[PDB]
Amino acid sequence: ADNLAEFHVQNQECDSCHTPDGELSNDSLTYENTQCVSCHGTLAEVAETTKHEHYNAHASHFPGEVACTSCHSAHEKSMVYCDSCHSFDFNMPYAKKWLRDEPTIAELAKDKSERQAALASAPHDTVDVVVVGSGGAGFSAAISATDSGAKVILIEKEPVIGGNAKLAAGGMNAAWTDQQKAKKITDSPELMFEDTMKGGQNINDPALVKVLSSHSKDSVDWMTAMGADLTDVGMMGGASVNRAHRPTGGAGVGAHVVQVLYDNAVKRNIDLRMNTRGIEVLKDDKGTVKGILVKGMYKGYYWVKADAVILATGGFAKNNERVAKLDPSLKGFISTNQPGAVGDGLDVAENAGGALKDMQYIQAHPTLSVKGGVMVTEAVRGNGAILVNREGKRFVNEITTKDKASAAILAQTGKSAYLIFDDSVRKSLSKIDKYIGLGVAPTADSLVKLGKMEGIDGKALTETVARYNSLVSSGKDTDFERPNLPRALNEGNYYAIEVTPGVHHTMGGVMIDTKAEVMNAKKQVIPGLYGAGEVTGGVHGANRLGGNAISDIITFGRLAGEEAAKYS
Ligand SMILES: Cc1cc2nc3c(=O)[nH]c(=O)nc-3n(C[C@H](O)[C@@H](O)[C@@H](O)COP(=O)(O)OP(=O)(O)OC[C@H]3O[C@@H](n4cnc5c(N)ncnc54)[C@H](O)[C@@H]3O)c2cc1C
Ligand code: HEM
Ligand code: HEM
Ligand code: HEM
Ligand code: HEM
Ligand SMILES: O=C(O)/C=C/C(=O)O
Ligand code: NA
């Protein structure tokens, strides 16, 4: 067969997958994916038949219920979504090579000739609030608005939910939480504000950072009340104390939080539409929002009438062309992001009159796996790993901020470095097992053997770990002044992970005030238009602290959904 539908229709009718009238149920292909499930079973049942030792197309880290049509199209060959970051040995029937080619918002002007027709028609739906983006900010705003009594529509352009938020690892920063007190940590909203402003080089909008710190415990409480486990508190870079919350054992915060949020939207019957891209915010004659034009992948353009539109579309760190324009030193770097994190959401915000700020501040994550091409969480250092160069020596304070860690790693021989840790570090952070399963954490019972495996000076590496361990026992790092030395690397086996910097987060974005209201260049609110999440600028200044983005999207998503519901 040339395609999946063709293959099935040799022995089945069209209505085995389609509805009685044959029209597509919706842009999420709800009905249609139900029929795939009907015969092949759920994704977990399918996963039993496609097992590989360390990977499985149908059993991944993605949260929510991943539709089969995310990767299997019927009437045409389709792409494996995992190929956008990994290069697993897959044999999906009717596959084609991963290639992301999505028209920009500007390029969609060519659809003038279908957009006017959609805009001339009646709204397809009339609701109170449309949320754009199913990342942590978007679900948060959707839930919060719904909880406040607003009727919401939540759209996501991708086939899967979660954006970059589902990939988060190290934690969600928050101060003075019950979770911290349980672990004997002393912190305060004031110290979090201080660490943040300093980490952002005091560029951050003080009012936004005050919302960030002061709502942080409340956001942790709200997540936990919805079912989140944020009881593990770890250290991340540039933080005076451990304040990055994540599930028991050091599991990734991201997939968990998004799963909680998705479960919570589902419980509230939130109208969630996949493969639906927000294209244009619609304003009435007084310039207040009156809705949004969307482009449903399967059903075309249509508009939704609504009082408020909350843009929660995330950053543009996957868009290296846009990135390089603003920061030519990041040209050609690999990104840690999901494939649609390209800044189309910012273009929508700008076309609606929203002004942008701090766009030139683009954060590179210092430790992408060279081998796997994926982020390796900063919690690996925060839990006690060190960085060594090819010469087998330390070269930076591993818990300094991301801009300084990146530059120090890029200055080492070969422009990469190695995370080194033992089994005590590995056991304190279950996420590390994920790197081991990926094949990117080679191991050996001695550092001479580890270094010989990876091309690291073995006996210098041994001297390096012995010296670091005596600094840990002394209590002070006189070589690089790492302020927190939580463990000695001296338990069990040793592991090395080759790392180099990758493009990760865009701190700039649309200007919002403390109620998450989008502002124009004159600093005037655009009535009904809200922004929440990495799409906004001004929260993180020149350099975001690790763990501050999950804190940001919950706080600001939640706040935007409440403010939009009340605006009404
Ligand atoms: C690999 C990784 C690990 C990280 N770990 C952490 C961590 O541990 N702590 C921390 O603080 N930060 C962390 N960060 C950053 C953090 O994840 C966030 O920046 C991300 O959660 C921002 O959430 P968001 O809701 O703003 O956007 P995202 O989660 O990116 O979600 C936005 C959604 O909008 C959808 N969308 C975009 N444009 C449109 C459009 N026009 N129409 C419709 N839908 C649209 C996008 O496809 C996306 O799904 C990490 C980031 C990454 C990539
Ligand atoms: C879009 C919806 C569906 C998806 C994504 C899907 C997935 C697939 C794939 C990938 C294959 C293997 C293709 C190949 O070997 O070339 C397959 C085969 C098959 N499918 Fe589907 N399917 C869907 C709908 C259905 C439905 C509705 C039925 C039954 C009415 C069904 C029953 C089968 C059967 C019987 C086979 C052959 C192998 C077997 O005996 O299980 N599928 N399907
Ligand atoms: C000859 C039998 C079939 C006919 C005439 C038919 C008709 C169509 C049409 C007209 C569309 C596009 C509708 C639009 O764009 O609004 C479509 C899409 C779709 N059909 Fe079918 N269909 C048939 C069989 C199947 C089968 C067997 C499957 C699944 C195994 C299937 C699953 C889907 C899906 C998932 C879509 C959405 C887009 C895509 O994945 O290609 N159809 N079909
Ligand atoms: C319940 C949802 C889905 C159904 C019913 C379905 C159906 C199937 C079937 C029947 C096969 C052939 C495996 C076999 O020989 O038994 C298969 C293979 C495959 N599917 Fe799915 N699929 C689903 C979701 C997905 C998703 C969401 C993705 C990507 C994230 C995906 C990617 C693949 C790949 C890459 C293969 C080849 C497996 C390998 O080479 O290990 N599928 N699918
Ligand atoms: C359904 C699609 C995917 C599958 C089946 C898959 C598979 C895997 C596997 C097998 C691992 C090693 C640990 C584990 O077993 O979980 C892994 C790790 C990882 N993958 Fe994926 N992957 C998928 C999509 C993606 C995409 C598109 C990205 C980036 C946007 C990504 C980012 C990562 C990262 C950052 C890690 C490191 C460990 C962690 O953070 O948990 N994955 N993935
Ligand atoms: O876990 C990490 O490395 C990323 C943290 C962050 O971006 O805040
Ligand atoms: Na931003």
UniProtKB/Swiss-Prot annotation:
Binding, succinate: G170, H365, T377, E378, H504, R544, G547
Flavoprotein-like as annotated region, ranges: 118-568
Positions that bind heme c 4: H61, C82, C85, H86, K431
Binding-site list for fumarate: T377, E378, K402, H504, R544, G547
Residue sites binding heme c 1 per the record: C14, C17, H18, A74, H75
Binding positions for heme c 2 per the UniProt entry: H8, C36, C39, H40, Y94
Required cofactor(s): FAD; heme c
Record field: catalytic activity: 2 Fe(III)-[cytochrome c] + succinate = fumarate + 2 Fe(II)-[cytochrome c] + 2 H(+)
Entry keyword Manganese: no
EC number: 1.3.2.4
Species name: Shewanella frigidimarina
Stated role: Flavocytochrome that catalyzes the reduction of fumarate to succinate. Is essential for fumarate respiration during anaerobic growth, acting as the terminal reductase. Receives electrons from the membrane-bound tetraheme c-type cytochrome CymA. In vitro, can use the artificial electron donor methyl viologen.
Similarity annotation: In the C-terminal section; belongs to the FAD-dependent oxidoreductase 2 family. FRD/SDH subfamily.
Effect noted on mutating R381M: Strongly reduced catalytic activity. No effect on substrate affinity
UniProt-recorded name of the protein: Fumarate reductase (cytochrome)
Species classification: Bacteria, Pseudomonadati, Pseudomonadota, Gammaproteobacteria, Alteromonadales
